[PDB]
């Protein structure tokens, strides 16, 4: 959709394969803090939160724990001790038009810094004086939702990168999303050590 | 860090005629620009931003153009007071950062 | 009228400190995007610093680690502390309110010269 009021999904009650995650071909950048990719493939959790969105290429460096910038200070801000990984794809074809793939309007005017995971979708007029632009014009009539103008002439740094961030919660965990090892046919008619689900 | 180079350096044109000023970028600046006229003795004044949008008040006599790595400002009829320095400011990277040009000296007769 | 007036400009011996201040009128600063610019004699301009509306500030790389912006919100004014002024920092400093895509920097300050002993 947009980095403005991003899209989310709460995965639970499944077997997290990961065989494609960070192993598909067109992935551009993937990096997690606290967890190794393979450990992730053997780690287990209670629930998962996926938060996908689209940002400008030159702003990918701002999606990081406590990282400071524009998109990470006034648009969408992730905690400082956030453990998990993000992945970003250069959608320089998937979301772009010579006419301007700016359907999405990122956030450029905010009253106060963001709390971690604070959806702040709003339609107001940041201003200086008494009234907003509904009754004033020129001075103090600013609107935080600015288009991107994604078009192909834009260089890489300004190509819409689609980014997806995974956050594993572990409080009180009747963990419903696991399963890295499930095979090997049983030997019969011989004294054998078996390990049936423990 | 896109390095901007203005051209020409100086210009002395008879009153009443047209004037053409070039501003040259080193990378893709699409339509992120602005033009400032810093009359000698105080801060600059914005004339034309983006590609060609005329800043409020700014006489229609000015016209900006260009995109990519090359931009141009054009003046219809130079009056005696148009003599000043002009700068093309780009902002393809707004998030605190900015990179200015070398300036152009325009005079009359 | 809408304006920005500056102070702190002067002369100081190398390695010394200084503090630049920026006052405004008929317009607020606490809730306004602020940007300090400076100009060396005869050269172009360069963005020096910025303070946001939440407090997260930023500085250019050439002056990173040495200058610190602050603002007395109570009386609608901005400040920039400088130290260890070397041969480069001799320049005229300007105060600016930059909006960006919705109108580039417009209202500026008269400027203030800051030179060093030599």
Author numbering:
A (entry chain A): 348 to 545
B (entry chain K): 1 to 109
C (entry chain L): 1 to 118
Question: How did the manuscript describe this experimental structure?
Answer:
Elite nAbs, mainly derived from the IGHV2–5 and IGHV3-66/53 germlines, showed potent neutralizing activity across Wuhan-Hu-1, Delta, Omicron sublineages BA.1 and BA.2 at picomolar NT50 values. In this study, we used single-cell sequencing technology to isolate hundreds of monoclonal antibodies from convalescent patients of BA.1 breakthrough infection and identified dozens of elite antibodies with NT50 values at the picomolar level. To further analyze the molecular basis for these elite nAbs, we determined the structure of Fab in complex with Omicron BA.4/5 S-trimers by cryo-EM combined with X-ray crystallography.
The BA.4/5 S-trimers adopt various conformations when bound with antibodies: TH003- or TH236-Fab-bound S-trimer complexes adopt the “1-up and 2-down RBDs” conformation, while only two TH003 Fabs can be built due to structural hindrance from the neighboring RBD. Group 2 antibodies, including TH132 and TH281, which target the RBM face and can be categorized in the RBD-2a community, directly block the binding of ACE2 with a similar binding mode to IGHV3–66/53 germline-derived F6129, CAB-1730, B3831, CB617, BD-51532 and ab133. Group 2 antibodies TH132 and TH281 shared the same germline origin of IGHV3–66/53 and highly identical binding epitopes. In contrast, TH132 and TH281 show a broad spectrum of neutralizing activity against all Omicron sublineages. The results showed that TH132 and TH281 are new generation IGHV3–66/53 antibodies with broad and high efficiency, and epitope and sequence analysis showed that TH281 and TH132 mainly recognize conserved epitopes that are critical for hACE2 binding or RBD folding, including L455, F456, A475, Y489 and G502. Although their neutralizing activities against BQ.1.1 and XBB were slightly weakened, possibly due to the only mutation N460K that makes the side chain longer, creating steric hindrance with antibodies, they still retained potent neutralizing activities at the NT50 values of 13–36 ng/mL. Structural and sequence alignment analyses showed that TH132/TH281 form strong hydrophobic interactions and new hydrogen bonds in their HCDR2, HCDR3, and LCDR3 regions, which lead to tight binding with the critical residues for RBD folding and ACE2 binding.
